């Protein structure tokens, strides 16, 4: 049988954060992926 091989979920990770003089709350952005493997 023939099995297609695909490199599994990968992508970039960006952190959205305001200035350090305001708050330390952050948001993670996983690029070009679905919200399933994360």
């Amino acid at each position: 049988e023939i099995l297609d091989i695909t490199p599994c979920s990968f992508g970039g990770v960006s952190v959205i954060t305001p200035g350090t003089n305001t708050s330390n709350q952050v948001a993670v952005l996983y690029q070009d992926v679905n919200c399933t493997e994360v």
Partner: peptide, 22 residues
């Protein structure tokens, strides 16, 4: 009229085509 998994990606533009049309 106008016409992968190796670490190379393309990021979508901030302004979508709908916003450019608007």
């Amino acid at each position: 009229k106008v016409t992968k998994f190796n670490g190379l990606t393309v990021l979508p533009p901030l302004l979508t085509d709908e916003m450019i049309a608007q």
